[PDB]
Write a protein that binds this DNA or RNA. Sequence first.
RNA 1: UUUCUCUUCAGAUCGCAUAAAUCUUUCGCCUUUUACUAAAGAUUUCCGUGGAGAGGAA
Lengths: 142, 844, 440, 27, 73, 223
Amino acid sequence: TKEIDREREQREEAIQNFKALLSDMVRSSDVSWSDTRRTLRKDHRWESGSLLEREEKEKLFNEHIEALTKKKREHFRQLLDETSAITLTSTWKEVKKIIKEDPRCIKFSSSDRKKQREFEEYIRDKYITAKADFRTLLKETK
Amino acid sequence: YEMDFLADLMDNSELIRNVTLCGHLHHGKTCFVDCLIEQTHPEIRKRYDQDLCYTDILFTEQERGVGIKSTPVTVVLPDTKGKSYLFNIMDTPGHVNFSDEVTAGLRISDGVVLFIDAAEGVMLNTERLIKHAVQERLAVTVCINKIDRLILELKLPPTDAYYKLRHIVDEVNGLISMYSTDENLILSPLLGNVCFSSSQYSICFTLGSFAKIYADTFGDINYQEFAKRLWGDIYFNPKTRKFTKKAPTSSSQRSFVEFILEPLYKILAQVVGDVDTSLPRTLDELGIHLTKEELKLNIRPLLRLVCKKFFGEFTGFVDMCVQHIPSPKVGAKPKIEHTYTGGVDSDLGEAMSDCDPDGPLMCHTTKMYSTDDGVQFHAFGRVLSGTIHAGQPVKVLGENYTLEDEEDSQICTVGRLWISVARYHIEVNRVPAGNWVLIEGVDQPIVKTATITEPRGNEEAQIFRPLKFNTTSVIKIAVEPVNPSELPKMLDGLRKVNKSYPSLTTKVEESGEHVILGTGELYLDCVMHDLRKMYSEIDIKVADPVVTFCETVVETSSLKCFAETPNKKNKITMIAEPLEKGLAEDIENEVVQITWNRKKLGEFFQTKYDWDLLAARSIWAFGPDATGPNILVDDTLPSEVDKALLGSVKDSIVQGFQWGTREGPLCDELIRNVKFKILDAVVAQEPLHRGGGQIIPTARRVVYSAFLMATPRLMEPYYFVEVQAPADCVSAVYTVLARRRGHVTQDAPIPGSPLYTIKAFIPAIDSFGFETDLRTHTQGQAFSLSVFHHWQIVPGDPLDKSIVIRPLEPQPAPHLAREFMIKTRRRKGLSEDVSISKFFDDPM
Amino acid sequence: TYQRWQFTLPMMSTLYRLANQLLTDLVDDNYFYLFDLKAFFTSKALNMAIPGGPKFEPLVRDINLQDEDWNEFNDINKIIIRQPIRTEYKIAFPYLYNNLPHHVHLTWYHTPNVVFIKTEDPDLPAFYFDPLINPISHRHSVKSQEPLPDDDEEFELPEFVEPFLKDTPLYTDNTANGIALLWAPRPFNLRSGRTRRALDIPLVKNWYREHCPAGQPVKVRVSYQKLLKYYVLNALKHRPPKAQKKRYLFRSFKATKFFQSTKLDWVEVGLQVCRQGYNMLNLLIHRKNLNYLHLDYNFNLKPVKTLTTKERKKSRFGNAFHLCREVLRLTKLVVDSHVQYRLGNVDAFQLADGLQYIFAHVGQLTGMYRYKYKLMRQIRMCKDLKHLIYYRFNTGPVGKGPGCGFWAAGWRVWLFFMRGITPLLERWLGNLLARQFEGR
Amino acid sequence: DHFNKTILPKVMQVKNFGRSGRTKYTH
Amino acid sequence: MIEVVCNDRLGKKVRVKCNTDDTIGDLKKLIAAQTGTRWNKIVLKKWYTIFKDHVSLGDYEIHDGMNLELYYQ
Amino acid sequence: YLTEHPDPNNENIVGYNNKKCWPRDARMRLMKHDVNLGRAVFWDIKNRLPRSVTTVQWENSFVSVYSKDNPNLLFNMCGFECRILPKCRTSYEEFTHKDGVWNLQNEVTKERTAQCFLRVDDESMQRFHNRVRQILMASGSTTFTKIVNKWNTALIGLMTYFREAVVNTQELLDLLVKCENKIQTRIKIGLNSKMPSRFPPVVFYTPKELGGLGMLSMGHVLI
RNA sequence: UUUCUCUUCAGAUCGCAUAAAUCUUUCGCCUUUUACUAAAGAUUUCCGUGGAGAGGAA
Ligand SMILES: O=P(O)(O)O[C@H]1[C@H](OP(=O)(O)O)[C@H](OP(=O)(O)O)[C@H](OP(=O)(O)O)[C@@H](OP(=O)(O)O)[C@H]1OP(=O)(O)O
Ligand SMILES: Nc1nc2c(ncn2[C@@H]2O[C@H](COP(=O)(O)OP(=O)(O)OP(=O)(O)O)[C@@H](O)[C@H]2O)c(=O)[nH]1
Ligand SMILES: [Mg+2]
């Protein structure tokens, strides 16, 4: 039971190998589980995780793709944090030129509508933080 | 034993045999030699409660138990019945790093002895040691110590014990047959190559001595007729009165089982149990008549006394050490053929081929030994040829010495000679060949290796090859002083300790750090103890450990690294790619050397590497120092045309590659699994501009541009932890290995005793106290041992400037590679912002 | 005089299976794992506390920490921190990790796991293959179904000698107990020892150095910590004594006519000593002409009529009367407890329970604090020894009730105490008797 | 003991100029 | 709840924890339980202000620390 | 500097004026770069003036370097010590035992820049030690009103000079409590040599307007 | 063969554990001291112990 737990509950080498094939053989979140599997079936390391089921493998691939997308979104947020023109009334399509040099905005996703949505989300987060700071200051305003 | 008789027997003949023991974690060695010293030196009596060492003259081994200092001893052992012989036994420790030390010190002995536990059996150190000894082409004489630990501790029957011994011998012979095809030494269960020992109880004998005992008390002719069938598969036939090797009766056991083990267990049960009742009734039949005061002892010393009176003076092991462990007159040929740099075709080769004390002198110091005064340490060495005398000067030499390089030489007068006993020392005025002498006065010019020739007349003398270890030391530690105004004393102690422990090697990087390289944790511990306590009395600070990594190419290079010379007359292009891992391990294992014909290397590549015909025929050169896995290649359409001019500037290119592989841009460490193929190489007809000034560094730049621009990846070492422990400790070991980047390789219930041997890897980054962590949770039942013999690539790709381990977290991400990169470049002082890919790209 | 003995084999096996309750049947000499002596000395000198409890104060070197903030030798950037280096690693082999060691000892490295076949009962044979380990070899490569070649010389190789041990007792006698005697380290490994004193044998020393607690509260843990502290501090101050020229008391008294030997029962001698002490103190107080005080035979000095004119300044002893009173109170209390035992007390285990409570009371009830405050060391020792027993005694059915316990350690400690402090009271009486009988 | 003995600055066993003892069952 | 110091300058500095609205008979029981003398024999005074075995504790209004010169009957 | 006064044996970080303001993440990062910068700057300034007129002694001076390796930055003015570090440039742990944090806003940008964590210097501490020791040695006849007045003067010397730092120095508060207890010694022991148990502070904290002392206290005198 | 006397030599964990005191240093205290706290070194005292004459009962 201890061995089967260290393998499957922790296959633990196979789970690490699945995560490693998702991290090394794949780097962009644009690829899904099915397409990435159909592409990487030719590889020799893909068969190393044969002990694991296809469902767990697809789930790990989806988790890795989501984590990569989250890292790209965090990088785009860090690039927008350095944007000097970014303010409350900052434009999405107008500021897209500023996010052209920053690869985190272009390499994250080729969806311009998604870029505008991310700009709106950053605007909302900045507004929430500003309102929080204003409430904190008013709490200490005599 | 009279010292005059020792001197007479020394310069008597080649009857004096040379031996070096071999064992692992107290499996039969220092207690055995304590029994030997008690047999030879009767006034040196052993204690009653505590065990007597007679091999740890120093204090660290006494306080830890694990011996460190190999203490060789020479004894007048009249163990051959009706004869006498001289034995030069080199005691040996058992720890893995100290096992590499012993393997470096095993060059001297013409043969090898093994002490395997009767219960534990085979371990990892022996698993490496058999291969090492077979690689050195030395004799083998198996012996089995701690036999009382089988009959008393386990309380087994005879038949199970004999089957256990059968399995031990079968495993040993299988390992040897896997090592090589030595049919002469292999298959040795009964020929004389099997000794028995109970060192704690002095129960030690062999088949020949057993038959001699029966022939002496009441018996027949010697073991040549009787001991040839005491081995199993042949029972006794009292009807026919002979050994029925054919279909025997039902109620019958092997002659070993009923002649040896039967009375053995009989006297054990009569001494342990019924010590008041069945003692005299069993001892007056066959044993001694010890006084009533002798029977007033505890069970253990009384049992040892009775075992010593039974095996009266241990006349069993000289009968085999002379049998198969050859004399030095015989072993001079292969030992010199394997050690000496040149071949036997040299005049010195055939000269020292015989142990002529009057001839060309070829001494060889291996282990450096200190004295009561730390400022002067002696040196022990095997005298292969010649005869050394008190005050005779000798031409000490170094490993870097050569027939053309006369720089590593320095004369020195041999001050005072001694004999190695490890408790006393016998002064000597004259030493014949086949001898071990404690040299004085030569302490200064000695290096990790040492060779000696005559100061005049011994010209045209080559040297012995630098010894290997079979265990690459990967640990890296810094040792800087407490007060910085103590540097020279610390460095003097460091040099003295380096000369003491040959396995390590001093170093000072570009960052001005005092670095040490050890094989294990306990190795560095004992080293630093002997440093701070013996070689240097200065308070010194110590940092944490770190493993010496190497670089590797994950895939083929993207673009051709065009590193052009500064003279605008040389355009070198080298495309690098990896190769098979087993081929690199064989190149490192001395499988496929470089000194071979073109057809030989071609067949080796077409069969082993499975390379192409023109691919293998176009072999360029070897790796750094002709020992590391760095494949150079040069093949192209114009490469087949203008290879002559480039061949003129190929020596500098190979030298630059060998010097660049020694320190790469990844982490300022070695490189492995690199196949540098030179495609574009402009060679000018004018050697002035095409000279060395634009050969070495341009090639280095091309090599680094290919190694950095071809998907690099580090290579961290993996140990091999063999933890013999019960099942609960097995689950605990699984938990710890899972918590420290482990990988369960093999785990099984090792028979003989309840010890589930867990064989699994541990990385050195997470190996900081594997034994300590295993013994902390397992309640002291999992004394494992590690050995670094497997390098693997970390899964990181430290080229992207996105991951940064700012806080003091242990890099849980797969950016652990970049974490170690930043840490290593900060520890080495080089530019931590490693971004030379664009700088060393060399656009053209 | 009952000097050394010479015990037999089964006489020790019977005593061993009796004492199996108070003994450690985990003989390996490896389960300590640097919870031993040398590791404790290293933990002290290194100034790091092992989690076993002994957290001492540092050595003469009072350097706490923060020798330097950020050197190039101790920079956090240039370190590959893959795992931590705890205090256990620093205690194992300190000369590597410990920066600037001093006065440090090392610890053994015992890999030989002591294997043993602990059978069930003495009905099995001696050398029985316990189905515990593994198959023997599971071998199948051996192929010798046909006869061997050594046949002609075999017939020419007779056995002209009697057998090896055919006239032996089948190697199956009362010997497995003899084998078990070996692994009994101190008591039974010695077959003929030397006459040892009663109190020298603690009977509890082997408990608080085996990692007893497995979820016990802070009380038992601090108790074992204090016990190990006393143990190690005793191990330190141990130099070989060779002096005093063999000066003995109660050996020359009998030579004079101020002493006579006799064989009188123990309770009688105790009551005699108590009455003599009370008589001595009463004659002392009477020589001082204080006719308004009374000890009451429990050695609780009682007033009479509120002496407060100039008398309360006349009865301010403070030093020795207080201490002699406390000591004789303890002695007379123990003696009267055993007198009630002989005089029809509870007479059961209630006696030993009472003795345990009496040592608790000597910890707290008996008023010896004022004359000497160093008592609190041994009183914390006794209070820790208390919970050392109940969590070994009150385990299983007995879970809450008052475990009567034993005085194997309490009485031992108080014996050592009185043995060490006899000369102080000798000196104080030599100083005081001259002031009340000679002058000033 | 009516007080909390936690709001105190660091600790207060006894300021009676007699704090020979040193213990609070931390270990 | 109250802590009282049944004190004396003759090797008896006793600390009894008395109840708030309790009598003195129980206080004498505690003083005997901690002092080692018969119950009915104990006497408590403060300059001849002999406290009796029926007058309550809060009647005199003793509070935490009020020491009492101990004497025996 | 190395041309004039080299240190090849690494004997350049031997004698260095370092502060005890938590030298684990706040002392000067004693690297080979910043140490040599500080020493050479000190010598360069010393080279300006003549050694006969005056010369800054290194045993009395104190350098404070700052680079990518030394984020801490120490000050020691005439009063209390100080250490500044940024708020958006990889700040330190920012313990803040008390509520002392100086949000140094940018003059032009108006954004939080740094936090100048303060701490009472050892000089004022030793001055307070000497004051308490002199008051304790002022016995024999001194009326208690004068003693309370002198202590109030001492405390309003310590307090009201630095306030943000008096709370940040935990040692300072502990020593204030110890000194108040030491004054209570002989403030309660001057009458009867007993050192009693409870002795409420209301005998002191009643001002002189009603008759008492007026001991303006800071330590926790639990009533 | 067993014990009691006694001058005598002990570096054996003199005693498979473990008491105190004096002195000299270092902390915590501190209202004066004695009682104290926990670390190092040394000298003594007590419960003792080991190996060698001579002299006394069974
Ligand atoms: O009340 P607890 O905190 O649970 O501890 C008690 C208490 O000992 P401690 O107070 O020192 O821990 C008792 O001691 P006294 O109150 O009597 O002085 C003792 O009882 P004994 O005196 O008989 O040893 C024993 O209680 P018990 O007898 O039930 O074992 C013990 O532990 P427990 O109460 O937890 O059992
Ligand atoms: N007498 C005896 N002791 C054994 C035996 N096997 C293991 N031992 C243990 O090992 C002790 C002696 O160790 P040695 O065999 O002399 O070991 P060693 O040569 O010091 O080994 P390392 O220093 O570890 O290389 C004994 O006292 C036992 O504790 C055995 O067969 N007989
Ligand atoms: Mg050894």
